[PDB]
Amino acid sequence: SAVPFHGAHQAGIATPVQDRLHFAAFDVTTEDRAAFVALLKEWTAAARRLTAGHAVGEGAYGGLPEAPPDDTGEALGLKPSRLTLTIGFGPSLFTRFGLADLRPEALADLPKFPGDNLDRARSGGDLCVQACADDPQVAVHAIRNLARIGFGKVVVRWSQLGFGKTSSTTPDKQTPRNLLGFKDGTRNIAGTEKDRLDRFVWAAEKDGTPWMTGGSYLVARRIRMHIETWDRASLQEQEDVFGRDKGEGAPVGKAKERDEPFLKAMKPDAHVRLAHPDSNGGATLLRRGYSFTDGTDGLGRLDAGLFFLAYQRDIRTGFVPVQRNLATDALNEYIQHVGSAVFAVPPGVRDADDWWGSTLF
Amino acid sequence: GSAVPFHGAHQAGIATPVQDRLHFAAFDVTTEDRAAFVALLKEWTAAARRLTAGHAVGEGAYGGLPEAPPDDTGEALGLKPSRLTLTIGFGPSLFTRFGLADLRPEALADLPKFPGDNLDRARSGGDLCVQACADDPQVAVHAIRNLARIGFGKVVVRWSQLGFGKTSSTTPDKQTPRNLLGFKDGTRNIAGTEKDRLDRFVWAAEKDGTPWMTGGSYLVARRIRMHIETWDRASLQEQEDVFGRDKGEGAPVGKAKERDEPFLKAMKPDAHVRLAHPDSNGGATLLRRGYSFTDGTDGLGRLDAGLFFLAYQRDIRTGFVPVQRNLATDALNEYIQHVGSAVFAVPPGVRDADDWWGSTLF
Ligand code: HEM
Ligand code: HEM
């Protein structure tokens, strides 16, 4: 029911993927380094209470009547729900507090990509908090209360709700389907693969930025799907687009979902064939994204898609080469990237005396 | 995880236990052909029979002819029914079409303007609605998406709302959820097992004046923004005074347990519970079935949170209208604003595998 908050790494990267997501990006409003470090300590203490299922501060009630409650209360009665809280620092953070020379070279600005249509209001951010849990209300309460505590030092720049499987009704041994109806996550780095995480996900000391050892680099892309167009495509177009069949998720010519793919049998611009590490010099990503449906836009269309999150040891050798290879992806007909951000995700909170960001400040 | 039976004298999704997630869609009709619209209603009912049992619509999600689009969009394959219910309603604007003018129920009342209303006309009204409730949100969206797909060219989605979590209860034996203000919401509601209160306050009766509505209900939807920044800097006493119940237990002021009966004269004169209580409104009683929502930021550095309020009642004129009129002085008004609104007549249930939605109207 709970996931331990402390560790060499932050939880919520290699740990079991929870049902729900509330992702929030913050901009910093203070110039005062001390004030920000104070806020980071306060957030860490709150993160400890939240991930264990307790209220923030002195609780949601029973305090002084003429004081506002420390905790806004909407998670009273709920369980920890495998809540994890992962914080990241955006490139723009390093223009403040005199940190410019501490920006990791692996925290690269993303190039412009063919077909990008990025909404500036839902891109970027000085820092982020990824809140995952099986109960969406536990996740929202976490973000809500962190924002309330940071008020006057940070504001919320943009926020994204997402969902994956519903674990109570779905087996953990079952690959979830994205909103295009294809199994999603078959060939991925799993949290059990310690040496693949070491090779592809975690920052190493030798990498050139010592404060980031044990950390990772995060790319977030808000990816709209053109649902109504996709759904008018023939079953064979859809399967041609990915290089797997829809029902079982097996590579073309093979029988089972987990049969290793034969890339020659796929069309040259099939998504799997272009995304595969063999087509990208070995480049390999940990994908940990979530589906979203935000409503319907002004033309009656379903505002829905994939909130794509990738973790990698170096953005220059993970997301960027692979996304570049998707220039000609047949999937591009049906999707559009409309938001984007990158973050340095620092190492974990080692113990009760540690705090978010301690190796950097 | 189990299914909720689709056939009945009433539509499910009303007195049914309240499921975790909501996808509510209002549709406008774009066809003039009454026969085309009846065909749609029959086809939608057939899809609903599959969807609420966990089956793909039509001939399934794959295995069909490679050159044709699949019947079911496929993203619910391998999922359980997840207590999905689908509830359909007819907006008053619909009765201007297909020569239904004289069949509009009297109890399908237009709502008056209320003080504080700031209603967005784009997120309001609608010829008809479909309330999809389920414990899995992928199941809920898949149902809306596939219903909208089947109606292409005869209906279009006007506006929709997702509720990520429930703020209502029809099962007083289970924990009462909390809304985003942190208070338990649903303690004194009507329970799915209280048959007499449902007949009395929720289900339309033959004698009420619209025979085709017998066994149906009437639905009021209000999209309500919450000023969480204002709320979150109010003291605990201020918060508890606004409602009349304490925040921790949810007990009426002065009492010890959530379910002790409120003693109204101990609440402030403008406390929300005092003004909404049936005893203050000549006995008027509602079935509340709403959900919380949050749709991003407000572009001013804050989270955008609200409550999608849904009430079922036997007659809007004797349900939502008097209670909301009595809320004109509610202390809660300082913290909320109504920003969308719609009413629908909800027809009786689909009786059997030969019946269909709206059959008693058409
Ligand atoms: C709407 C957007 C996207 C959808 C619907 C989608 C869908 C899929 C599907 C169905 C698979 C096959 C099953 C699996 O192995 O997970 C897959 C594989 C993969 N995708 Fe995507 N994808 C999207 C965007 C992206 C992006 C932006 C990237 C990277 C820049 C990416 C990288 C990959 C990788 C690395 C694999 C594993 C390929 C392999 O080794 O077999 N995908 N994706
Ligand atoms: C954001 C808006 C609202 C919030 C946060 C809210 C919250 C609450 C709370 C905390 C309670 C006490 C617990 C309970 O018995 O459910 C309650 C009760 C109630 N509310 Fe509201 N409410 C809202 C809007 C409305 C509206 C618009 C109406 C009617 C038009 C309404 C009608 C009622 C009724 C009838 C009760 C039951 C009172 C009783 O019989 O004891 N509420 N509400």
Author numbering:
A (entry chain B): 56 to 416
B (entry chain A): 55 to 416
Tell me, in the authors' exact words, what the paper reports.
Herein, we have chosen to use an extracellular dye-type heme peroxidase found in Streptomyces lividans and referred to as DtpAa. The overall structure reveals a ferredoxin-like fold typical of dye decolourizing peroxidases with two DtpAa monomers in the crystallographic asymmetric unit. Heme enzymes catalyse many essential reactions in biology and understanding their structures throughout their reaction cycles is of high interest, prompting extensive efforts made to obtain ‘intact’ structures at high resolution. A major challenge is to obtain the higher valence states of these proteins, for example peroxidases (FeIII resting state and FeIV intermediate states), as these states are phenomenally sensitive to reduction in synchrotron experiments caused by the presence of large numbers of solvated electrons or other radiolytically produced species, generated by the interaction of X-rays with the crystal.
Serial synchrotron crystallography was carried out at Diamond Light Source beamline I24 at an X-ray energy of 12.8 keV using the same chip and translation system as used for SFX at SACLA. Following each translation of the chip to bring a fresh aperture/crystal into the beam, a series of 10 ms exposures were recorded using the PILATUS3 detector in shutterless mode. We first describe an MSS experiment series comprising five dose points with a dose increment of 32.8 kGy (MSS1). An increase in unit-cell volume and trends in scaling statistics clearly indicate the onset of global radiation damage resulting from disorder in the crystalline lattice as dose is accumulated. With increasing dose, distinct changes occur around the heme pocket consistent with reduction of the heme iron by X-ray generated solvated photoelectrons. A near-linear relationship is observed, demonstrating that water migration away from the Fe is dose-dependent under the conditions used. The elongation of the iron—water bond is consistent with FeIII to FeII reduction.
